[PDB]
Structure 1
């Protein structure tokens, strides 16, 4: 795995980074990138290689500023993933909200310094996620990891995340993929290397933060 300072620099440079949570938690790797300048072409890559459920981790302060309430008042998710109501960008260039162009635009608009509630149509096709106030030390999730990277890299407090799936194998002429799943551990590292990305664990990210904050 790469050292956290090196992951931070790549993130500050607007690159995706590959982040693995604990094997005892989801044991999944997500692509994580700063939302502020995610490009159409980057989003297309993200959609191609992930589950396609493109989420946007943001702080509680941003969910209040942008008027993004939780999708459900009584959260039945076992991890408590804090989905807000979904959004599309209110912009003349938006069409159906689902294209790489449109999803990237929604993410950049969520991160804009001048963002306001009226800039988003609800419901939509991008899923903001409310990070907990305590950050990665408090909840060891990809939501917190994305917001933490934004803070560490001096970026706007909105990230973009999605899980890296194992799409299995193509079957010529048949609408199925054999042996699909989720990418794990070493394969996630190999994926990062193939695409020129840094890769790390939330555990190491927490160790980095503890250098300044101590153990929660």
Structure 2
């Protein structure tokens, strides 16, 4: 397909309760992140993500939601190679045990994204990793974090999505051909950040 078509197909997939495989630039991370809307991701989708992802399952959120939840950025002097926007980590205050099962990570995501969520609904630290997206989305920063928020908002959801990088069992990160094969195995749409940037520049 074309770039705009891949974006459109990705929005349909998110609306249908399917995941999307998001590939960033080859000259950047060259990684594929599986993403789901925070509002609809299931425990089975979370199990899938832990099984075949890095297991570092992230919750992409806006600056306003970060402030609503009172989640400081993890560090002041961000020296990460890619400037990744990790906040302090989180666990649901209620409805979990140790916080790390697929079910507990989903409970934590739902507590964080609920309308009216308050800081006391989350304990810290925890086993879910929120990432704060920059305003302007992929028009500001071409990361998976912004890409996730932009796809959610374009699909009609709250600007809140769950992401994890796809990993091969031998410990190497999946490259684009592996990400596309995996997307086929799990009926996910595939889209690139480059597609998304072009789409938003036009639209």
Secondary structure at 1:149's aligned position in 2? helix
For residue 191 of structure 2, the aligned residue among 186, 189, 200 is 200
Cα offset for 1:187?
1.7
Q: CA–CA distance in 2 between the matches of 1:89 and 1:100?
A: 13
Unaligned runs of at least 5 residues, structure 2: none
Matched, 1:75 2:75: no
Equivalence for 2:68 = 65
Contact 1:18/1:197, CA 8 A, preserved across alignment: yes
Q: Secondary structure at the match of 2:35?
A: strand
TM-score of the superposed pair, with normalisation by structure 2: 0.95
SS of 1:182's equivalent in the other structure is coil
The separation in 1 between residues aligned to 2:7 and 2:42, in whole angstroms, is 24
The Cα RMSD (Å) is 1.1
Match of 1:112 in 2: 114
State whether residues 110 and 158 of structure 1, in contact with CA within 8 Å, keep that contact through their aligned partners in structure 2.
no
Give the Cα–Cα distance (whole angstroms) in 2 for the partners of residues 76 and 83 of structure 1.
12
**Deviation string, structure 1 residues 128-182 (Cα, Å, up to 9, x no partner):** 00001121111110000111111101112211001001112xxxxxxxxxxx311
Counterpart for residue 150 of structure 1: 152
Gap regions ≥5 residues in structure 1:
169-179
Corresponding residue for 1:134?
A: 136
TM-score of the aligned structures, taking structure 1 as reference length: 0.89
Count of matched residue positions in the alignment of Structure 1 and Structure 2: 200
